[PDB]
């Protein structure tokens, strides 16, 4: 209700303020332009207020010109400063306070004086005029009682317009008014999980009533909602509400779960709000309500709709915080909130993030630049000295103290004015850097990962994986090339990011490769959901990872809280055949449905299945090996299951030269953990060869290497550490002389 | 059909301007506003009557395209 | 040396913290350098501007508000949070009790600080 | 003062926590006689977590006892 409340006189003032920026060569419309535009319209009520206060027009211009400056500007893009919209926001509040229904020129002056931060506020402040003095100047110069008492009305709240408008839910309003206009099943039921928005749906329907948007069929109908917090003694009160509604003919009920006769005859047009879990348990089982309800699919809005909602609601937050918000930050905040936070859905997680970012930047910017603190301390100490001198009957020093205090106060006022002029001159825009800092503190993701543009991360994936998984270039290149095709858009959007089958000897590094891929993609090492197929052997176990059937009492619950995770399966060849039917659905459709009816998404998860089959054949070119291993893979698996796999990964055996690099990587990783003590650890080539043959076993792979390192290097290092900081800040060298392990202690 | 919305907005803004002028102790400008509001109400009534007469004159029949949609 | 030298209703059941902090009789709140900033950050938001201290009893929750009032005397709070008295409601005081909060909440809104 | 709240003898509180872990093998053998490998393995495994070689988030250690 912006243009609907402004009168003809206010539009002239706004036009004058807009045209003043062109003459003043200002690219932004500040609070000073509104004051100048108001003095050029001596026809409204505000003219008489300033006339009685001995305030002319020429004095205001010369007073406001000194505070402001002059500079270059651009052509067009004449927007409003964040401080300027606060006056417009306060004018409506002032109009509502005085029991008025219009926004004229008499409210612009009142709103300009309540800012206390812009250029216009100081002009009134310097003329011994405050809010209290100007408040009285304009004032002196100027039915169904049971239902309305046992429930909460909605049209009354929407009539005043004190809440944010419902923007972006236009699709559901049309469906609701379409269902309400039907003859049979004219009682829509809002179906959706708690967290996507269901109570606010009726608020949007009620808002359109005031705007005269509903047709004549839905014209002049009050919206009433019956809360569940007010409920044998309560049954005597509901018998009269239904009778009152029937006699009125215009009351619309809104419930969230006796009333079977009321709904069978079409007497009450109630709107349900029950979730899908209870809809199939308290409504579908009853035939009386099955023929009178129409479910409506209500879910969270898409990413594009959230950007529009935030753009529509941008003006509201730019006034309470007085921080300019650019378009680049709005589109980034929604993406960041949808990427990391996955517990409250949309769009409630996109407004609080930008609100916190704006509050943080306003708090950081609105501080003292080490200028007023010293002056305030000097004023305080001078006042204390004067107070001490007064009680000491020392009037000789008090004369000098009073003059010093007056000079300090004058300097403090000048410094505050010159400090606030600079702050008013500049603009505090919001960028993605501020939002990244706020979002980093909620999950713990390092700032170096959030600021990534998701452009160089995929290109350097081959180098990142080799840091933790050395060797096996064929396995790394295949997955790096297969994961980027789905992200670019070459693959079907509904299918998951990728599906792979790990084959080869046990203990070769499949789990380490999965952990490295998860850390390099999602930025977290613990963002992996490990599902062990060893426990899924009987038919009764298939109801565990998909959901417990009703009447009796995993994967779906875990994947919902972490939509960005790598699913890892162990021993996929040992599982119940019914599990493959569930698994194929994930790869084909992309989403599952549990017993509660809630649908989980799998478009942001990498499915990795590890099988031990074919290990006995390798131990007895990469393309030839893949072709030979493919024939034996379908012998015990479904012929059509392997067609849905993006690629087959075959690992190779670990040679003698590859084992030295594993020990080197382990030593380097151990060194990083001792960064707090500044310990340098270096291992010679002889020691790496000596320790490699101790745990050399093709059956276990690199597993025996950890035990040898922990029993050889760590055991001797721990004793030296616990000798009273013997090697604190020094260099430790490990060299094998041939018989035992020689540890030489040096300096750093 | 994008006919009565503008007339309703004009009537609303004229009523709001008259209400603002009443509290401003400016009765000279309110005389024209009252006549303008009366003329706008008469025009709105005529436009609504002629719009609903045309709707009553015609009939809407369902086709196979609507069922398919 | 001696010879040679307001909202009263709202404050009836609540104790003002800044009055106690002005004299400096209690120990200064030193150590909560990250909680006062978080509280003043949450209080400066358009939505969800009512922070709630969550923690087990024994880590310190009532004393957190003392530090917020302490910064008022030291001129550390910004202009938005300048000259605002903080009152703590006593839970041990409580139909009969419903008539007292209505008068307190009306005065709190009118005071604005 | 702190000894009077838990009953811990003063000889136990006043320790540098540097020689107690080093002499853990001798201390355990006083009350447990035999099976030197089990005592040595746990004595070497428990001192690595306190030194800092083990991740701070994980606990001090985990052991599985097997045998009669
Ligand atoms: N390419 C590699 N380079 C260095 N170390 C590796 C490599 N592959 C595996 N490792 C090491 O293997 C060790 C064992 O890892 P983990 O216990 O996850 O088993 P795995 O070898 O992946 O086998 P499995 O698939 O049978 O569980 C890890 O500590 C890791 O350091
Ligand atoms: N190596 C040992 N040195 C000294 N005493 C020992 C040793 N092993 C066992 N004991 C003593 O044996 C006694 C009998 O209990 P024991 O330790 O044999 O069984 P346990 O380990 O407690 O049995 P369970 O496995 O059934 O719980 C104990 O009081 C213990 O002092
Ligand atoms: N059209 C909309 N635009 C922006 N935010 C909305 C819209 N509709 C609902 N919301 C948000 O949803 C929240 C209320 O959700 P609620 O109705 O409680 O969900 P549920 O009914 O599932 O508990 C409000 O805080 C509001 O910000
Ligand atoms: N910043 C601080 N520095 C030192 N001590 C503090 C600080 N904040 C609180 N305390 C201690 O906490 C105690 C009060 O705890 P209290 O708030 O009553 O805990 P709870 O609210 O859980 O009962 C005081 O005795 C005080 O010594």
Residue numbers in the entry:
A (entry chain K): 1 to 142, 159 to 247, 255 to 279, 281, 299 to 594, 601 to 667, 681 to 808
B (entry chain L): 410 to 478
C (entry chain J): 138 to 142, 159 to 247, 255 to 273
D (entry chain J): 479 to 546
Q: What text appears in the publication on this structure?
A:
ClpC-WT formed three distinct species in presence of ATP that corresponded to complexes consisting of 10, 12 and 14 subunits. This finding was important in informing the cryo-EM data analysis and guiding us to classify and refine three distinct maps corresponding to the 10-, 12- and 14-mer at a resolution of around 3.8 Å. The distinct structures all represented ClpC resting states and were similarly abundant, consistent with mass photometry data. The differences in subunit numbers of the ClpC resting states suggest that assembly or disassembly of the complexes happens by addition or removal of dimeric building blocks. The three oligomeric states aligned to each other almost perfectly (CC of 0.89) on the “front side” of the double staircase while they differ in the “back side”, which is open as a cradle in the 10-mer and closed with a seam in the 14-mer. Furthermore, the overall resolution range increased from the 10-mer to the 12- and 14-mer resting state, suggesting increased dynamics of the 10-mer assembly. Similarly, NTDs of “back side” subunits of the 10- and 12-mer resting states are not sandwiched between MDs but partially visible on the inner site of the complexes.
The AAA+ protein ClpC and the peptidase ClpP form a major bacterial proteasome with crucial functions in bacterial stress resistance and virulence. ClpC forms a hexameric ring and threads substrates under ATP consumption through its central channel into the proteolytic chamber of associated ClpP for degradation. ClpC is usually repressed in an inactive resting state, where two ClpC spirals interact via coiled-coil M-domains. This study reveals that the NTD stabilizes the resting state through multiple anchoring points to M-domains and ATPase domains.
